[PDB]
From a paper:
Cell surface glycoproteins in the C. albicans Als family (Als1–Als7 and Als9) are most commonly associated with adhesion of the fungus to host cells, as well as more complex interactions such as invasion and biofilm formation, for which adhesion is a prerequisite (7–9). Als proteins are one of the most widely studied C. albicans virulence attributes; deletion of ALS3 produces the greatest reduction in adhesive function. The N-terminal domain of Als proteins (NT-Als)4 was implicated in adhesive function, prompting work to solve its structure. An invariant Lys (Lys-59) at the end of the PBC recognizes the carboxyl group at the C terminus of a peptide ligand, allowing the remaining peptide backbone to associate in parallel orientation with β-strand G2.
Specifically, Tyr-301 and Thr-116 side chains that flank Lys-59, positioning its side chain for interaction with ligands, were mutated to hydrophobic residues. NMR analysis showed that mutations in NT-Als3-pbc (K59M, A116V, Y301F) shift the conformational equilibrium toward a monomeric, nonaggregated form of the protein that facilitates structural analysis. The crystallographic structure of NT-Als3-pbc revealed that the mutated residues in the PBC maintained the orientation of the wild-type side chains, but created a hollow, ligand-free cavity. Unexpectedly, the new interactions in this mutant protein also acted as a “zipper” that propagated the contacts of the flexible C terminus over the surface of the adhesin. Therefore, NT-Als3-pbc recreated the conformation observed in the NT-Als9-2·Fg-γ complex, even in the absence of exogenous ligand. Importantly, the mutated side chains were buried in the PBC, and as a result, NT-Als3-pbc retained surface properties of the wild-type protein. The NT-Als3-pbc structure revealed that the side chains of Ile-311 and Ile-313 in the AFR were exposed to the solvent and did not stabilize the interaction of the C-terminal β-strand with the NT-Als surface. We used structurally informed mutagenesis to remove essential contacts for ligand binding (NT-Als3-pbc) or to exclude ligand entry into the PBC (NT-Als3-gk), without affecting NT-Als3 surface structure. Loss of adhesive function for the Als3-pbc protein shows that Als3 binds free C termini of host proteins and excludes the idea that Als3 interacts with ligands using surface-surface interactions. Structural analysis of purified loss-of-PBC-function mutant proteins showed that the mutations did not alter the overall structure or surface properties of NT-Als3.
Numbering used by the authors: 0 to 312
Write the structure that this text describes.
Amino acid sequence: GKTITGVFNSFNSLTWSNAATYNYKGPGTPTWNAVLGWSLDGTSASPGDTFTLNMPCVFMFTTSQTSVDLTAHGVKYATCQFQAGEEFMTFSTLTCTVSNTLTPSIKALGTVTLPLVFNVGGTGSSVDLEDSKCFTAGTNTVTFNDGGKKISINVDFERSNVDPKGYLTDSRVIPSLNKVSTLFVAPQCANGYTSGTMGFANTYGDVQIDCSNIHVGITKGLNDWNYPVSSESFSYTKTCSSNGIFITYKNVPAGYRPFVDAYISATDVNSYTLSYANEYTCAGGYWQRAPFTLRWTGFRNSDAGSNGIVIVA
């Protein structure tokens, strides 16, 4: 029937719950539990009606579930659907629907908790690049929307403990494609890069590179969690197979960091290994060829649930 608004009306709590062993409290590190207040009124809301909650800068929900129910006392008065932004968009949403239990008489209240990770960058995609300027370390204000009607809360974010002068890698799962997105940023040559090679290959036949979905570029500095803030182009040659992706670059400018990121499929996405190529000759003669191998593991999923109170009137 109608498309109601203002159901989610309060941002009660936004608290971190380290999913795995991350050594900092960042928005890009799971899991952040958003507790939101909701209220449905039978007099003004009818079964079938629909409401969206729009959540900017939220990458995905760190749960295997595809929906969460608004449940006041073992009873379900609405079903909500998770729509992760991932790499498709900069925001995620909750598309909900009123259940047939919400009769004119019934008024349901309560809270819902939502395991969410933010997108503070991670690839050259327009999506991550915009979302890479969404938060900064320290005290931040996070705002969700319900159709013109906003709910906000303050939260403290910590920067990364990894020193941004060395080589930097990260990884992040994309469930809607069964793909893991990984990143590689060469060590910092403060005055620019003369030459260099950089990439990553699979190890022992479990990893494959999605050649179609690569990004290669240079970043003018980085954001607080060691992710690219912008992707320009520069002078490289590109070799890419389903086995592994490598570039040989030249003629870099001071203040810029070269990076390469790509979609992959590994057998067990919560345990895999990659081999990284690493030469760089700085603007300064410091030629050094330092390849390595890095193992990548899993996150600890959480649950979305709700509780509530009902008033039969």
